[PDB]
Design a protein around this ligand. Structure first.
Ligand code: NA
Ligand SMILES: [Zn+2]
Ligand SMILES: [Zn+2]
Ligand SMILES: [Zn+2]
Ligand SMILES: [Zn+2]
Lengths: 286, 131
């Protein structure tokens, strides 16, 4: 059994030298012998590679004392309805040097905001992982036409995550002590969260008694929604996948059973808006 | 398309550490809570007659050690995250790491928790004889 998490997206499928491969699976076949690997003097290390590593496939089912879990029950979500923010991401596709993973392109929220990121991925090198721009294309097909202009209008991730934190802080400061991202088919939204979410034990704000909702890599400090100006990471968010509540069929068909005023505009924020709308109708009607 | 690098047994721990603010602490805490060590490391078939030094160009396991590919024993390599140091470059990737056989069930945790003697090249507490 293998997973897609951390799949090596290099166009040409090959493994690495045993000293460089992150895992047994990823070692070059030349070095493998029944479950083990051999060193072969004469077949040297690769000192120039750049291998795109897929962030698709995270599973947040950890159980670690003192670390709150990101994904919450329906009952806990309902207590925290004032914190609900619908969230959806449209991606672009890795291309040229790499194929097989998707990069966040348009990030949409139930506030109506869409943020556009330059295509950026995690690239292994002989010395580290390089968070860097990667070649990408919009999804092929006419239903994806609106994504073509976005491909050259993105912002760098350091700007995007600051804008996310600022949007969430402005929206939530007078609503809740947390955020609950309301998702539908959460896989790629969770992938996208890798770009702007950090987790750990509960902390307090560096300026007041409220729980920390944000983190600053520059200063290694924490803050609540009221005091997060300039902060770059969302810290300990919560989240729920509405699709997991037993629906059959797509988001729009289920949304439309209860609501007639959200026409599908085929954009990330629209999915985010319909997802929060459906969640409200399902949890609070009947 | 693409080439899988991981197995399902590591999904949980790798996901946890990849999002963590303090990955090292996270792995330690995860282990302390009963989580299984990271598997799918690059374990070497070697003679077991080497020098026993901790971090080497070729496998150097002695009779009481296992040799591993170095990147595969590094938490930051395994989670594809930034490294502690100022340059952000790894000391294990590109080398072989010898692990005491008693500790070979968790090579990532072993390198995370231990230190190498810069004089004799042996792990402190697991080979270093220095006065
Ligand atoms: Na591009
Ligand atoms: Zn505060
Ligand atoms: Zn609606
Ligand atoms: Zn490393
Ligand atoms: Zn010594």
């Amino acid at each position: 059994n293998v997973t897609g998490l951390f799949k090596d997206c290099s166009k040409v499928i090959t493994g690495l030298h045993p000293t460089q491969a992150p895992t047994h699976l990823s070692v070059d076949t030349k070095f493998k012998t029944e479950g083990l690997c051999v060193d072969i003097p004469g077949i040297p290390k690769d000192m120039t590679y750049r291998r795109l590593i897929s962030m698709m496939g995270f599973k947040m089912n950890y159980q670690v004392n003192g670390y709150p879990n990101m994904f919450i029950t329906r009952e806990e979500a309902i207590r925290h309805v004032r914190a609900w923010i619908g969230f959806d991401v449209e991606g672009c596709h890795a291309t040229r040097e790499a194929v097989g993973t998707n990069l966040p392109l348009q990030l949409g929220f139930s506030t109506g905001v869409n943020l556009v990121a330059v295509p950026t991925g995690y690239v292994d090198t002989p010395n580290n992982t390089d968070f860097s721009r990667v070649s990408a294309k919009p999804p092929p097909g006419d239903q994806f036409k609106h994504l073509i202009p976005l491909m050259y209008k993105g912002l760098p991730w350091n700007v995007v995550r600051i804008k996310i934190v600022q949007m969430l802080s402005d929206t939530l400061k007078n609503l809740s002590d947390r955020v609950v991202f309301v998702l539908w088919a959460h896989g790629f939204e969770l992938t996208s969260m890798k770009y702007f979410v950090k987790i750990g034990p509960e902390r307090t704000c560096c300026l007041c008694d409220r729980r920390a909702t944000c983190f600053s890599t520059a200063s290694d400090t924490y803050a609540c929604w009221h005091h997060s100006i300039g902060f770059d990471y969302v810290y300990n968010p919560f989240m729920i996948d509405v699709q997991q509540w037993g629906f059959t069929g797509n988001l729009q068909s289920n949304h439309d059973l209860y609501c007639q005023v959200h026409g599908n505009a085929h954009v990330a924020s629209c999915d985010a808006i319909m997802t929060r709308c459906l969640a409200v109708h399902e949890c609070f009607v009947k | 398309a693409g080439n899988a690098t991981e197995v399902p047994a590591n999904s949980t721990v790798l996901s946890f550490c990849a999002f963590a603010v303090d990955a090292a602490k996270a792995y330690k805490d995860y282990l302390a809570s009963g989580g299984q060590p990271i598997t799918n490391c690059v374990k070497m078939l070697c003679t077991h007659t080497g020098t026993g030094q901790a971090i080497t160009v070729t496998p150097e396991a002695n009779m009481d050690q296992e040799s591993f590919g170095g990147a595969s024993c590094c938490l930051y390599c395994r989670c594809h995250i930034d490294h502690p140091n100022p340059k952000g470059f790894c000391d294990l990737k590109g080398k072989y790491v010898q692990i005491p056989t008693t500790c070979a069930n968790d090579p990532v945790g072993f390198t995370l928790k231990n230190t190498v003697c810069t004089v004799c090249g042996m792990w402190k507490g697991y080979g270093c004889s220095c006065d």
